[PDB]
């Protein structure tokens, strides 16, 4: 019975990390696209563009971390087992 | 499909060796050595270059431009031979698979299987490049200095990410080359399940584009090797 | 074929047809071949122009803060001051490229770029 | 300068910056034309 | 099939040989040619 | 037997494709570079004569 | 019965968090892309752009937070169990 | 029998919330990207631009809410039980 | 036998609305991005922008609505039940 | 029995509709983005622009209809039943 | 036995149509966005802009067709049945 | 036993083809969007734009082909049967 | 017991290739879109854009082919069996 | 019971790797799009653009392999086995 509970927990944690990976990768790629475009158009602006960047990547990479944390809770401390 | 299954497997020095992969690597090595020796015999500064001279000149010029555009040739003289040899080795390994060396057992067998289809070959090249550019970084920065810059990277507060990206440099560089050729070894096997009268079409269309795919993979491997050197060195 | 005309503020500077034109506008590098959509742009302060003249060799021009216009009829390069590659004084351009004045330095660097560095 | 609306293309960078960098050039060319015409009138 | 093997070294050795030959037969020669 | 033949027909098709559409550009490209280098050697020779 | 419901709840919460992470990461990337582009282009605008940026990020992280709350409900207070 | 339906309803509600979160987050990010760019290039226009923006966010948010409703209908008022 | 079909119908309706919400949110975000940018650049044409906007949204909201309808047909009038 | 077949058919039809909705919504939102941007930059072009628009929307909304033609086939006919 | 295979084939065909619809709709929308923008920027280009379009559509419509075939194989000629 | 493996293979091949169709269609659409936009910008570059295009199309269509092969492995030559 | 593991491995490999194909196709399309746009704006840049292009492709392809490799491990050498 | 555990772990790892592939490929493509465009506009900017680029890619790749690091933990360690 746990069998089924922990199998579902594994699938759910896989879903959590798949969504976190998609969101983190694509959001970081988009923020990096903006940063690279800004540094290419304004070479001297790079110093400034890293504060908006890490804020963006801060919100993006935060979500991933939370997902990762919850995945652990799903996988190593599966609720309702 | 019998994925895996290296033939000519033997054992020496208390460890196992995939004979077929070694044979393919030796064939590629002898082809590259023949090209190099024919160049050496017929390398002309004043005369009209031969075909091999033009090939080697174009490849060396491309890699020299890559090095100069990322890390000065004065700093990185040893990386041009590395880039040229990696490029030619991977290119010949991939292109030798286009020869019709596939027959029927009743499963499909292949006299020459591209060495990059084996994990050992791609892992060997990737780890050699990894050790080489980490040693170059140590030389240009110091034994203790280089690891500190590697961990710090360009952003200090992203220290773990760097330590991951670093370990990602070999793995990807290996697996990116592995799966691309390994996958092909499966497709040709899968296409072998067709009867002869319809097998030639998917096989032909696959391998015609596999020529370009192997060329692009050799180019990417060499280009990313040069890029990693540029990075690890300054 | 392109109707390429380069017009300095003082005078019309060049009017030969061409097959391809090339220059670094303020928002990136650009190339124009016939039937390009209408466009307006500002060449970089140290810009240079390559005109792929159909008959003879290409024409390399050092341009001083010019503007570029593309139209259904012609490709116009408005110029404050320009010099063909043959007229550039290499030593003078080299000396100016190190000048402290922004305008003089940009003009000298443009001359160097057009000449062939 | 007066904006003269009358009865009735692409821009790089955007038309605001290009127009701002062009208007001083317009004033310069109009002053140049004024000087040339003043020289002609003087002669 | 993803587990490395002894062939690893058997490959590396061979590659090194090529790396050696191209290091002297090819690059410096093509280098000086160019 | 059947597999060999079919992959041999596939290789024949690949060879025909490369010979008809890939060989002409590359071989002649190398060829044009060749012409260029030889004519450059020629210009050097002429300049020496000058 | 309990095992099946728990496994289904785990998979559903995994779906909730995966979708929430995808939305949050990609929306944060898309909003921070505009923030970085605007700051690059108009450095003095850095102060004025943060109000639209915070409105957008609030709208995105509100979706993320609602998804997180509903995943917590699914896995810790599994309805119908 | 109720356990199977409950697990299916939990999976379906998780799917609804995942899709709603993805759509809401990405649509909010896209609309906010438009708003941020328009306010960067036209500082005084933000008022004009908040009109279409809230219309867009209105259509986006709306969808999420509807999903949030039906997930509840799936989870608390499972139609098939 | 009806429990399995009911769970399958719940999962199918969840998929229907997940896809519908993703499409609706992202399509509305993209169309609203167009509208906001066009109004920012050329406000004098604001009215002219609403005919091509509500058309596009009218398409997007059709795709959503249809899906919602079918979701109902899946959960309340499950075919083959 | 065929109850499993019916549940699988419902899940498959749900996938068909979800994918069709995502594709239609996002694709016609992109096409409408192009239409709105073109009309904003050239408010007099609206007539000319509706020709290519309805072509791409004809391609984007065809894919939807076909999927709706097959989802209906899955749940109402269930060919493998 | 055949019931499980048929249910799996229906789910697989649903996945095939969902992915084909997503790809076709979004790719056709993107290509149509390019076409509409090109025609808006300059009308006379329309005649040429339909050659790259029908090429791109031909690539985006081929994939869908391939999926259209394989789903038809999955459900009507279920391999391994 | 063969029934379960065949159903799983059908679902996996459906995933392979759905992902392949999504990737190929969207990548072809993006590359053809670039091609259409370029040929609008500079028609005389049409022939010069078909080299980077077919390379890009070559890169995505290679992946698709590999996908189409592996699905054929899953469906007709189920590796673990 | 081995049948269930084999079916799960087939589904996991299908997911791996679906994600890899989506990422490969879309990322390659985006990189080639940048390449084609650059070669349209400056047709003489072809030579210099293949270096940053094949770098980008080299990154994108990695995500694909690594996944491909692991599918084989899932499919032909299933970690559990 | 371990068969269900392994099947669930394989499906979860497939989801992890598929999401990582999607995120990594698409984000790397998005960032390399900016890189290629900036190099096309300013070739001399090449070396300048690789600093931010390899930061952003450095994050994106880090989202991939971390996910991969977890997929191994799912399939080779299989927590809860
Ligand atoms: C870093 O650690 C966090 C952060 C969160 C956030 O959700 C953001 C996550 N994201 C960046 C992906 C966050 C939040 C919530 C918001 C809710 C609405 Br509605 C609207 C905007 C919001 N913006 C938000 O910040 C961007 C939040 C939630 C919360 O409660 C749990 N307490 C908070 O206060 C201390 C709080 O702020 C820090 C959650 C969390 O949980 C595991 N751990
Ligand atoms: C405060 O945290 C919230 C917010 C919501 C929202 O849905 C938005 C969530 N979003 C960010 C994804 C929100 C909402 C609903 C709308 C419905 C339509 Br139709 C059209 C536009 C809407 N715009 C909306 O906000 C812009 C909402 C819904 C609601 O219903 C229970 N009560 C509300 O008042 C307290 C409420 O706030 C106005 C839901 C929620 O549920 C747990 N918690
Ligand atoms: C909370 O409010 C809503 C709104 C809806 C909508 O579907 C919008 C969904 N969106 C936000 C993603 C909405 C709608 C339908 C359209 C149909 C076509 Br065809 C074309 C355009 C449409 N545009 C629409 O937006 C305005 C709608 C549906 C409806 O249901 C029979 N009755 C309506 O009349 C009162 C109605 O408003 C005209 C649904 C809903 O369901 C719980 N709750
Ligand atoms: C809101 O109401 C609808 C609308 C539809 C549409 O599919 C559009 C849905 N979309 C906007 C998401 C619609 C349609 C079909 C097309 C087919 C091809 Br091929 C090419 C272009 C098309 N464009 C279309 O409109 C944009 C349609 C379908 C149809 O048959 C089912 N009969 C119709 O005429 C009475 C009809 O209207 C022309 C279906 C439907 O079904 C539940 N309910
Ligand atoms: C509306 O009715 C349709 C249309 C189709 C299409 O697939 C297009 C669907 N799309 C817009 C989402 C269509 C098609 C196929 C193509 C194949 C390749 Br390779 C390359 C380009 C293509 N472009 C295509 O049109 C744009 C098609 C398919 C077909 O199937 C044997 N027979 C056709 O007649 C020769 C046919 O043309 C009308 C299918 C269908 O089936 C349910 N019903
Ligand atoms: C209905 O038409 C098709 C077309 C195909 C393609 O896959 C493209 C599908 N896509 C656009 C979504 C196509 C193809 C293959 C490529 C392989 C590599 Br590696 C690299 C680039 C490729 N580019 C390709 O098209 C640009 C193809 C495959 C093939 O397979 C035996 N034979 C071909 O004959 C030469 C062939 O060209 C027509 C397949 C197919 O089968 C179901 N039906
Ligand atoms: C070995 O590499 C990593 C890195 C991580 C990160 O999660 C980022 C992963 N990403 C790039 C996809 C990372 C992180 C966390 C953040 C949390 C918030 Br809230 C907001 C921004 C964040 N940005 C972050 O980096 C961009 C992180 C995690 C962590 O673990 C407790 N300890 C950290 O500090 C010592 C830490 O920082 C470096 C995780 C990980 O686990 C397998 N391995």
Swiss-Prot record, chain C:
Protein name, UniProt field: ATP synthase epsilon chain
GO terms under cellular component: plasma membrane; proton-transporting ATP synthase complex
SUPFAM superfamilies (alphabetical): Epsilon subunit of F1F0-ATP synthase N-terminal domain
Record-stated family: Belongs to the ATPase epsilon chain family.
This protein's UniProt keywords: ATP synthesis, Cell membrane, CF(1), Hydrogen ion transport, Ion transport, Membrane, Transport
A Pfam family assignment: ATP-synt_DE_N
Record's subcellular location: Cell membrane
PANTHER family listed in its UniProt record: ATP SYNTHASE DELTA/EPSILON CHAIN, ATP SYNTHASE EPSILON CHAIN, CHLOROPLASTIC
Keyword Chloroplast tagged: no
InterPro entries on file: ATP_synth_F1_dsu/esu, ATP_synth_F1_dsu/esu_N, ATPsynth_dsu/esu_N
Main location: membrane
Topology of this chain in the membrane: Peripheral membrane protein
A GO molecular function held by the record: ATP binding
Organism: Mycolicibacterium smegmatis (strain ATCC 700084 / mc(2)155)
Entry function: Produces ATP from ADP in the presence of a proton gradient across the membrane.
Subunit structure: F-type ATPases have 2 components, CF(1) - the catalytic core - and CF(0) - the membrane proton channel. CF(1) has five subunits: alpha(3), beta(3), gamma(1), delta(1), epsilon(1). CF(0) has three main subunits: a, b and c.
Coiled-coil blocks: none
Swiss-Prot record, chain D:
Residue span relative to the full protein: 206 to 256 of 307
Residues passing through the membrane, by range: none
Subunit-structure text: F-type ATPases have 2 components, CF(1) - the catalytic core - and CF(0) - the membrane proton channel. CF(1) has five subunits: alpha(3), beta(3), gamma(1), delta(1), epsilon(1). CF(0) has three main subunits: a, b and c.
Protein name: ATP synthase gamma chain
Superkingdom classification of source: Bacteria
S-S bridge residues: none
Family, similarity comment: Belongs to the ATPase gamma chain family.
Organism: Mycolicibacterium smegmatis (strain ATCC 700084 / mc(2)155)
Subcellular location field: Cell membrane
Function according to Swiss-Prot or TrEMBL: Produces ATP from ADP in the presence of a proton gradient across the membrane. The gamma chain is believed to be important in regulating ATPase activity and the flow of protons through the CF(0) complex.
UniProtKB/Swiss-Prot annotation, chain E:
Parts of the chain that traverse the membrane: 2-22
Cellular location(s): Cell membrane
Subunit structure: F-type ATPases have 2 components, F(1) - the catalytic core - and F(0) - the membrane proton channel. F(1) has five subunits: alpha(3), beta(3), gamma(1), delta(1), epsilon(1). F(0) has three main subunits: a(1), b(2) and c(10-14). The alpha and beta chains form an alternating ring which encloses part of the gamma chain. F(1) is attached to F(0) by a central stalk formed by the gamma and epsilon chains, while a peripheral stalk is formed by the delta and b chains.
Function of the molecule: F(1)F(0) ATP synthase produces ATP from ADP in the presence of a proton or sodium gradient. F-type ATPases consist of two structural domains, F(1) containing the extramembraneous catalytic core and F(0) containing the membrane proton channel, linked together by a central stalk and a peripheral stalk. During catalysis, ATP synthesis in the catalytic domain of F(1) is coupled via a rotary mechanism of the central stalk subunits to proton translocation.
Family the UniProt entry places it in: Belongs to the ATPase B chain family.
Name of the molecule in the record: ATP synthase subunit b
Annotated gene: atpF
From-to range in the entire protein, with total length: 24 to 57 of 170
Curated annotation (Swiss-Prot), chain F:
Location of the protein in the cell: Cell membrane
Transmembrane annotation, as ranges: 3-23
Superkingdom to which the source organism belongs: Bacteria
Family, as annotated: In the N-terminal section; belongs to the ATPase B chain family. In the C-terminal section; belongs to the ATPase delta chain family.
Subunit text: F-type ATPases have 2 components, F(1) - the catalytic core - and F(0) - the membrane proton channel. F(1) has five subunits: alpha(3), beta(3), gamma(1), delta(1), epsilon(1). F(0) has three main subunits: a(1), b(2) and c(10-14). The alpha and beta chains form an alternating ring which encloses part of the gamma chain. F(1) is attached to F(0) by a central stalk formed by the gamma and epsilon chains, while a peripheral stalk is formed by the delta and b chains.
More info: Binds 2-aminothiazole antibiotics, which are antitubercular agents.
Protein name per the record: ATP synthase subunit b-delta
Provenance organism: Mycolicibacterium smegmatis (strain ATCC 700084 / mc(2)155)
Part of the intact protein present: 1 to 50 of 445
């Amino acid at each position: 019975p746990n069998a089924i509970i922990t199998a579902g927990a594994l699938i759910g944690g896989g879903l959590i990390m798949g969504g976190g990976a998609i969101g983190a990768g694509i959001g970081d790629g988009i923020a990096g696209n903006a940063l690279i475009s800004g540094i290419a158009r304004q070479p001297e602006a790079q110093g400034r563009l890293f504060t908006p960047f890490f804020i963006t990547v801060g919100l993006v990479e935060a979500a991933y971390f939370i997902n990762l944390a919850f995945m652990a809770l799903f996988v190593f401390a599966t609720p309702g087992l | 499909i019998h994925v895996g299954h290296h033939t000519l497997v033997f054992e020496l020095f208390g460890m196992t060796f995939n004979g077929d992969t070694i044979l393919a690597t030796a064939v590629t090595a002898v082809i590259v050595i023949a090209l190099a020796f024919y160049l050496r015999a017929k390398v002309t500064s004043t005369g009209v270059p031969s075909g091999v001279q033009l090939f080697w000149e174009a490849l060396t010029i491309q890699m020299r431009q890559q090095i100069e555009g990322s890390i000065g040739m004065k700093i990185a003289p040893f990386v041009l031979p590395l880039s040229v040899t990696i490029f030619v080795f991977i290119l010949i390994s991939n292109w030798l698979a286009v020869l019709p060396l596939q027959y029927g057992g009743g499963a499909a067998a292949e006299l020459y299987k591209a060495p990059a289809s084996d994990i050992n070959f791609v892992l060997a090249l990737a780890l050699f490049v990894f050790v080489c550019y980490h040693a170059a970084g140590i030389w240009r920065r110091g034994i203790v200095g280089h690891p500190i810059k590697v961990v710090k990277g360009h952003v200090a507060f992203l220290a773990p990410i760097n330590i991951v990206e670093e370990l990602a440099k070999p793995i990807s560089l290996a697996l990116r080359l592995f799966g691309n050729i390994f996958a092909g070894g499966i497709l040709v096997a899968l296409i072998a399940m067709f009867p002869w009268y319809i097998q030639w079409f998917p096989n032909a269309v696959w391998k015609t584009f596999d020529l370009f795919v192997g060329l692009i993979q050799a180019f990417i491997f060499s280009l990313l090797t040069i890029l990693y050197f540029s990075q690890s060195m300054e | 074929d392109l109707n390429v005309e380069i017009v300095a503020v003082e005078r019309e500077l060049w009017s030969g047809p061409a097959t391809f034109v090339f220059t670094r506008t303020t928002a990136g590098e650009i190339g124009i071949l016939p039937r390009h959509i209408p466009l307006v742009a500002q060449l970089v302060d140290d810009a240079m122009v390559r005109v792929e003249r159909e008959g003879e060799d290409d024409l390399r021009i050092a341009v001083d803060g010019g503007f570029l216009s593309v139209t259904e009829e012609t490709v116009r390069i408005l110029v404050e001051n320009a010099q063909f590659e043959s007229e550039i004084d290499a030593d003078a351009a080299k000396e100016d490229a190190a000048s402290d004045d922004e305008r003089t330095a940009a003009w000298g660097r443009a001359r160097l770029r057009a000449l062939g560095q | 300068m007066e904006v003269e609306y009358v009865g009735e293309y692409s821009f790089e960078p955007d038309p605001e910056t290009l127009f701002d960098a062009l208007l001083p050039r317009y004033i310069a060319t109009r002053v140049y034309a004024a000087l040339l015409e003043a020289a002609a009138s003087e002669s | 099939f993803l587990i490395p093997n002894g062939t690893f070294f058997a490959v590396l050795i061979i590659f090194l040989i090529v790396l050696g030959v191209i290091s002297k037969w090819v690059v410096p020669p093509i280098s000086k040619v160019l | 037997m059947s597999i060999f033949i079919g992959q041999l027909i596939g290789f024949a098709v690949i060879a025909f494709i490369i010979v008809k559409w890939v060989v002409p550009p590359v071989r002649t490209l190398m060829r044009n570079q060749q012409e260029a280098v030889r004519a450059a050697l020629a210009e050097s020779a002429e300049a020496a004569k000058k």
